[model samples]
Target: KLVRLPGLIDVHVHLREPGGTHMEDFASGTAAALAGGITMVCAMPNTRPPIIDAPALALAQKLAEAGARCDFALFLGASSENAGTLGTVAGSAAGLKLYLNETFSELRLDSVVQWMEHFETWPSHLPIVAHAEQQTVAAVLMVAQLTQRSVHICHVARKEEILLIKAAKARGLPVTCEVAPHHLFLSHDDLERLGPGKGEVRPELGSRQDVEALWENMAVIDCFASDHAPHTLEEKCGSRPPPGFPGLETMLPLLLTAVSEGRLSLDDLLQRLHHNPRRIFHLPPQEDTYVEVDLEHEWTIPSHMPFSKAHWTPFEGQKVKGTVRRVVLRGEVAYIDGQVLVPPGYGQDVRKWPQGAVPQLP
Candidate 1:
C-alpha cells in the first residue's frame, strides 16, 4: 500500500529556460519536478534576457504554459532600473525576486535605500522575495520595519541568518524565510569529495555548527525549497563553476529519510513542504493533487541519469529510505514508478490569488 499526502509545492527553482535551455528547460525541469512529487513550483526570473519587465515576464509565462508538466508561477526580477515596473505587474505573477548582492544575474540592488524604495512601491498583497546574504537579510528586515511590507528571504544558510529571521518574526515583522536541502545535508567537508561540480552553491555550505543550527531552529523555518539551479557538467567543471546544484528530484527523498530517522516528524515535513508554501505564497488548497510514497522502500540514488537537463547531482550514490511511486496533478497521474505519464503543457498557471487572500488550512 502507498501513503498519500498533499501534493508538494516548491517555491524556489531555476528552470534556466529562455536563454539557458540546453542546461534545463521548462519541459525537462517540470518533468523532474513531477518525478519528485512536486505538483507546483515557482520559477525564479534570472534567465538569459532576465524577466525584469512586463514583456519578459509575459514571455516567460507563455513558455511555462506551453511546456511545463506541472502547475507553474514565474517571479519577476527586480533590478536598479525596474523599481517602477514592479508595481505595474505586481498582480500578474507570483511576486518580485530581488537579487540583493548579485549571484547569477546582473540585477542587483547595491543600496539599502534603493531596496527600501522598491519595497515601498510593491503592493502589500504581493511578497518581495529576496536573494540575501547576511547583510542583505538585515537590510530586508530594516526595510520591512520601515515600509511594513512583508519579505520572504531565500536560501538562509548560516545560524546567524536564522537567528535574525527569528528575531524579526518575534518583533512582528511580516517576514518569512526558507532553507534549502543542500544547506541542511551538505557541509564544508563535502567540498573536497564532490569538487566544484557538485559542491558549489550560493551562500555556500557553512560549518557543521551552522547545519546543526538549521535543524535546531526548524520550528521557525517557514519552508523547504530545492533552489533547483541546474548547470551542465562542463560548466560545473570549468574554470568557475556556477553556485547552484539540482535538487527537484531529491528534496523529498532526503527529507523523508530524515523523517524515518526521527530528525523530523511527518507533520513537520508537511508543514515545511506543503502547508507553509501554500500559506506563504497564498496558493489554493491541494485540491485533487497528491503524491504516493512507499515509506518502507529503500534505494540508492543513481550515480547518473537525472531527469534534469543538468544530468548530475551532488547526492549521487547516496542511500535513502522512502521513494515516490506516483504523482497525481489535479487528479491526473503525472508520474508513476520511474516514468512520466503526462506530457509537457499538462501543467497550469497556479498564481491566482494575492498574498493573504487565501486562508491557511488547519
Candidate 2:
C-alpha cells in the first residue's frame, strides 16, 4: 500500500554532459533521480554542444535513449549566438528556455522579450519558461505582450517578487512559477554554515520571512523541482559559482519531512511535486505508481554513494526522516528497501508532446 503520493516529475534538472562531464553525466545523474523517486524529468540545455538547436536536441534525445533510467525531456536555450537557431529549437522542443538571469549567462532581457512575442504567435502552444528572478518589471513586460500564452517562472528565490507573481496570477493571468528544494530548505544563514560551497544565485536565498511568504503563497506557486546543478570541487571552490547547491538525491525526503511538519500540507506537496508538473509539462500518467514513504523510517545520510560524479550534495550531512520505502515507475518496482532495482536503461523515453496535451492557445 502507498503511504504518501505518487513519484515526482522534476521539470528542471542539469545532468551536465555532452560538454560538462567532469561534474555529473547522464548515467550518474539519472541514477540519482531514480533513487530519489523522480519518475520523469526535463534536463537543462547548457551542455558542450548545447541543446540550442534542433540538431543539438536530437543529440540530447539520442543520449536519453542510450542511457537514461527515467522518462526524460529537454529544454532548449536561446543565446545571442544561437538565437538564429531558435526556429529549429522551437520546432523540436516543448517550450523555449530563456536564461534572463545573470547566473546562467548574459542572455539579455530584450532577447527574451523578442522570444516571448514569437511564442505568443507561434503555431504550436509553445510556452516560454523564463528564468526570472527579482526582475519583476521585466516579467511584467513579457506577460503584457504574451498574455494568453503560458509563461513559467523558474527558481523564484526572492520574497517581494512573490507578491508580484501573486498579483499577476490573481488577475487569472496565464502565468505560473516553480520553486526548488534548496530554495525552500536553505537560506542565507546556510551560506555561513555550508561555507562558500553554496555559491551565489539569483535572488540569493532570503530570510525566514521570505520562506514563510513562499509557504503561505503556495496556492499560486505552480510546481516544485530539483535544479540538480552539480560541479567539480574545483568548479565550486574560491570563485563564486552562479548556481545553487545540488538536490536531486534529497528532494523527495526533504519534501516528505515538510509534509510531516506544518511547513507544507500533504496536498501542497502533491500539487507542487506531481500534479502541477504533469499538467504544466503536458505529461500524462503512464500508470498510478507513487512512492511509498515510511514516515518512521529515519536514516542518517551516508557521505558517499550518490551516483553523480560531483558526489557532493547540499543535504549530505543532514539527517532526514521519512525516507523512500519503495518507488513504482510506470507500475514497475524501480526502487525498494534502499536500493535502486532498475538499471540504467530501465525507463523508456516519453514524448515531449503527450496525446492528452490540449492545444488551447494559438
lDDT of 1: 0.85
Clashing pairs in 1: none
Question: Best by lDDT, which number?
Answer: 1
Residue range 283-317, candidate 2, lDDT tens digits: 66767567777787667656544566766666656
- Clashing pairs for model 2 are 6-290
Tell me the lDDT of candidate 2: 0.71
TM-score of each: 0.95, 0.89
Each prediction's whole-model lDDT (CA): 0.85, 0.71
* Poorly placed runs, candidate 2 (over 4 Å): 1-4, 81-92, 103-113, 120-124, 136-147, 240-242, 301-305, 352-362
Q: Write the per-residue lDDT of candidate 1 for residues 227-308, one digit (tens) a residue.
A: 9999888888888777888999999999999999999999999999999988787776656889999889888988644589
* Regions more than 4 Å wrong, model 1: 352-362
